[PDB]
Every structure is written in structure tokens, then in C-alpha cells.
Amino acid sequence: SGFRKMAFPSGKVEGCMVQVTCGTTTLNGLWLDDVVYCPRHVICTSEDMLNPNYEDLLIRKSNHNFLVQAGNVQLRVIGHSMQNCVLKLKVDTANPKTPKYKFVRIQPGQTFSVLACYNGSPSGVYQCAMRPNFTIKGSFLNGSCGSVGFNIDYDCVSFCYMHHMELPTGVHAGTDLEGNFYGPFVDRQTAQAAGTDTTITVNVLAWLYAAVINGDRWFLNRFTTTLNDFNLVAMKYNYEPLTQDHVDILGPLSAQTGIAVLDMCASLKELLQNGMNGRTILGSALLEDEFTPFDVVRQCSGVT
Amino acid sequence: SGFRKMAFPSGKVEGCMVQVTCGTTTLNGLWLDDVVYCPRHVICTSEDMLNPNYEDLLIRKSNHNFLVQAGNVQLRVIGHSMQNCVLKLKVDTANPKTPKYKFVRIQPGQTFSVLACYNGSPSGVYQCAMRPNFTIKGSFLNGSCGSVGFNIDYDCVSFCYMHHMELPTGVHAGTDLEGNFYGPFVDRQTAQAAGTDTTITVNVLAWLYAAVINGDRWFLNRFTTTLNDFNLVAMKYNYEPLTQDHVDILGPLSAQTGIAVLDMCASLKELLQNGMNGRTILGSALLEDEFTPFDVVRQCSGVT
Ligand SMILES: O=C1C[C@@](O)(C(=O)Nc2cncc3ccccc23)c2cc(Cl)ccc2N1
Numbered sequence A, B: 001s002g003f004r005k006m007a008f009p010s011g012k013v014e015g016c017m018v019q020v021t022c023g024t025t026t027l028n029g030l031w032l033d034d035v036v037y038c039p040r041h042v043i044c045t046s047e048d049m050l051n052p053n054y055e056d057l058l059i060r061k062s063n064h065n066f067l068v069q070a071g072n073v074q075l076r077v078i079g080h081s082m083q084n085c086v087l088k089l090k091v092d093t094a095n096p097k098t099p100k101y102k103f104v105r106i107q108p109g110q111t112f113s114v115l116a117c118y119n120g121s122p123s124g125v126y127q128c129a130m131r132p133n134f135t136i137k138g139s140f141l142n143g144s145c146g147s148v149g150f151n152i153d154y155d156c157v158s159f160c161y162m163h164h165m166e167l168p169t170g171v172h173a174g175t176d177l178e179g180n181f182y183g184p185f186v187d188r189q190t191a192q193a194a195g196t197d198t199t200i201t202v203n204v205l206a207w208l209y210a211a212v213i214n215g216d217r218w219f220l221n222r223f224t225t226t227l228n229d230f231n232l233v234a235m236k237y238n239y240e241p242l243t244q245d246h247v248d249i250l251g252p253l254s255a256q257t258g259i260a261v262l263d264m265c266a267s268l269k270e271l272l273q274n275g276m277n278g279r280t281i282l283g284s285a286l287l288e289d290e291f292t293p294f295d296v297v298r299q300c301s302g303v304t
């Protein structure tokens, strides 16, 4: 028992991290097969970042201007291309530590592990969620650019996120591995509005099921609700509306605990209207929305 | 910016995890050089665990009864010995993935990363603290035994914890890598009292400094205090007494923020006496004690 914000083991991703330098800018790159992926802002100077013309800036660059270092050995760049907001540097050596992998674009509300890196070196691993507004509440400093987000299914690493920037608000923005930003964000040093964020309702319900599985049951009540009634409350508290799709994904947890989804919704409704009254759930004094129903079942069943 | 409960990258430890079977019991082992370390309860049956005579039980076992599997290849056991609560299985092959390592016994209040494993396979990584009462609030299911806790300093892995058991209270207990339990715990299926736990005061102060570094400053007040006055409050709220040693370790954070340690103590005193009033600090509605002053500086400076 016990419930922790658990990240995937980072080993398969650590073997892919490289350092990419172009001019005076150094950031992280992801080496898979004979290709290194990194943010396209690696080609910028400080004056360029205010309004960069990436096409023009990349033209002034040659393969030899991209210094790729894997650990302490240098990689030879034989090709360069821009795909949306990432650069793909073709190297002459295939990474011998390339795991089985996929590039996937995650949906908001889904979770992933981030391997924070500096100078191509892994420094830490943490679990986070893609916010409904397409930002991530990470932990990233200057040089962290190029760090990736991923999920692991047995031996396959699904890369879903590459870190690009920190908005003036302190939240983080980035792309999938094809260079498409999640959200309305652009890779420019400009004020950018992230939308109104909401709480991931299905995840909070999954975490309430994890609390029940782990003995924390004080919040359970003698009430039930309807999807429509619950959603009136969810709207008032900036929670994502619950759909039958969310109810269906909560099926396994509803079966394991024997608590119908709408009964757990009623518990959540009372928690939202009345607060925690100074109590905690799984060691937290607020409602946690960074565990999906899949995460809760995985952790509560020990999937390796 | 941003502050996350970050674990160390688990790659160096994943390369050491093996599966150890003895009779019908399977748990995790740690393969370093030509030695596999695992909990000595691997030699027990269910009836044995109530009051095991480990010396007698181990006598009935031979090298060939210990099945050690690294990934999918079998290791040949050429020696077996019990050291306190761990078994050391000498194998004829040195682990080619053995990182530079040390066995260290951590002090209560210190933190470490856990690589949760099942059947010798890593399933997740999370950061936790050794509670002042020598328990850990982990996330462990049956089969997790043998999972280890560690810290990483550049290329050196300091192993500090091996998981042994879950107490009836849901908290976790285990040993250092020499088999010495942290706390009064014994490896028996018996009711065991963990002492009264306290909050790691120096860690909460470090986390308050991390909040200040990250912009969350609402809790800062126009007050100061003395070590003696603050400790009267710490005693009342089950917080560890603050010593000049803790003040000295907070030095770097006091210098970075320009907030004297006793001024931060006064902020903490008001937070303890008056609560959070429905506000949050670094996304948390309670006072976090699982980040040491070293963790805060490391994360806030990006040490790889
Ligand atoms: O300040 C910058 C540099 C930049 O490379 C960046 O934000 N990176 C970092 C990434 N993540 C977190 C950070 C925290 C502290 C400083 C830097 C961070 C950058 C890139 C873009 Cl596409 C737009 C604006 C900027 N503005």
C-alpha cells in the first residue's frame, strides 16, 4: 500500500540524452537511431529570440555548426532539417542504446514522466500531467530545453513531450517529438497567454479510488448524484465536465472498490462544496488531479 | 522555476536489479560486482514468517536453491551468507552494469530515491524521506521486497535502503545494505510499533526557501524569533527541534534569498499557529518536509 507520485524508470531515456551546441547556445537533444532531436531555438542568439525568423537563421547554419556530444564522445552531423519547432540532426552513428520507441501526441489530462537534463546530462525524474490548457507545471531551469516527457509500456518508450520554454507565469511549454507545440504557444520570447486551466475531474476521481484502495475512506458519504447534477458543481469549481467516456475509464476502479462512479462523484461534490475541513487524503490537503485511472491501476497492481 | 518532488535518474540502479527465488518465494535482489543482495526473508515460507529462526532456515538451503535471474539470463550462485537481515549470494559473474557505488547508512530526515521493483523488473521511481521514526512512506506491494533506496553524486550511487516489509499501519520498513534495520523493526510478521513521528523542521524551512526562490512569498512576515522561542512552538506542533547545525545547513538558502534563518523560522511559527487559511505554497496545502536543504539547492541550481 501507499500512493506516491511515481515516475517511470528513466534508464531507457537516459541512454538517449545528448548535448547540442550551435554557436553559443547549448541545450539537450534526444538521440534515437541516427537522428538527434532538439528545440529549433538552439540556432538563436538572445536578440533573435524576441522575434526569430527560424528559416533565415537556419540558412546561416551548416552541419558542422551543430556540435552533438553523447556523453564524452562527439557525433558527426551529416544532415540537418527543421520540422515545425524541432531540428532533426542526422548523425552518422545509430545510438546503440536506442530503446524500442514511438512518438505520440498525448491528450490533455494525460500524465508522463519528465527526465530533466542540463548539458545532455540527466539530473532528475518527476511525474506530471499535461494540463487541460496544454501547459505543464514542471521544474526546469535555463539549459533544461530539450528535456523530454515519456511513458513506458513494457520495453517501449513513447515520447510525448520536448521542453522548449518557460512562460513569464512560471509554467512550462513545449512540443510533441514532431515539433508541434501543445497549446497556442510559439517559440518566441514574448508574453503568451495560457488559457484558463481546469482540474482534471476523471483524475481526481481516480485518485479518490486510490485513496479508498489504501484505507483513506473518511470522505465517502451516504449520497449519490447524476452526471448532470455533478457537472453543475464541476462547472462552478473549474473542473472538467465528466462524460460517460470518463465513467467507462473509471470502470475497473469502480469494480475493485465496489463504489459506483456516481457515488464517488457525490463524494467529490461534497469535498468541493465543503472543503477538507483540515483533513488529508493520501497525505495531501488538496484534491490531486495528476494521476490518471490507468496510473492508479498500474501503481495499485505493480505493473513493471 | 517550479518545484517538484524529483527523484534521481534510475538508470544506474536499473542495471543492478535481479530476481531472487528461493523455494516458492520470489523477491528483488541488487547485483553489484559478483554479489547479489536481497532480504533474508526470501528463505521463509508463510508459516515461518510469524517467528522465523533465520539461522536454522538458511541451513536447510544450498547455493543451488537460490535462483538468481538477471533480465532473462540465469546467474550461477557459488556462495551464500547472511549478514544481519540480508543475504549475500556470491555469483560467478560480475555485473557488467555495476556503477561506481557505496553503501551508506542515512540519517533520519535525509531523502532518497526508491526504484520500486517486482520480479527483478523496475516499475517506478519516487522520492521519499527517512522519517524521524525510521519508517518510509513508500508505495510498495507484495513482491516489492528487495527494492532499493539510493542517492547519486555525479557517477556514484550511494545505496542506503533495501525494502523489507509493510507494517500493519501501512508504513514501510527496511535495512541499510549491510542488513541493519532502520528503527526498532525486526523481519517478522508481528505487530511492531513505529515511534511517534515528527515533522523534519530543517526540511520544511528549506522548502519555504524554495517557495521564496520560486515566487511564492505570501507567508513572509514582518516578524523574527529566537531558536528557543521557535522550538517552544516546534515542540507544540510535533516538529523536530531546530539546532544551530540546522541553521548552518540553511546558510546557502539564507544567503540566496537574503532572508535570515530566524526570520524564516518566524514565518514558519505563524504558519503553524494560524494554518494556511486555504492558501497553497508550491502547489501544496500543507507544509512539505521531504526536501532537504541540499535537495532545494540542487533542484534550484540544476546539478546533473
Ligand atoms: O528565458 C528564456 C530562454 C529560453 O530558452 C527559455 O525560456 N528556456 C528555459 C526553459 N525552461 C525553463 C527556464 C527557466 C529559466 C530560464 C529559462 C528557461 C526561451 C526560449 C523560448 Cl522558445 C522563448 C523564450 C525563452 N526565454
Ligand SMILES: O=C1C[C@@](O)(C(=O)Nc2cncc3ccccc23)c2cc(Cl)ccc2N1
Pocket (backbone or CB within 6 Å): A001, B041, B049, B140, B141, B142, B143, B144, B145, B163, B164, B165, B166, B167, B186, B187, B188, B189, B190
Ligand atoms: O504480508 C507480509 C509479507 C511480507 O513479505 C511483506 O510485508 N512484504 C511487502 C513489502 N512491501 C509492501 C507490502 C504490501 C503488501 C503485502 C506485502 C508487502 C512480510 C515480510 C516481513 Cl519481514 C514481515 C511481514 C511480512 N508480511
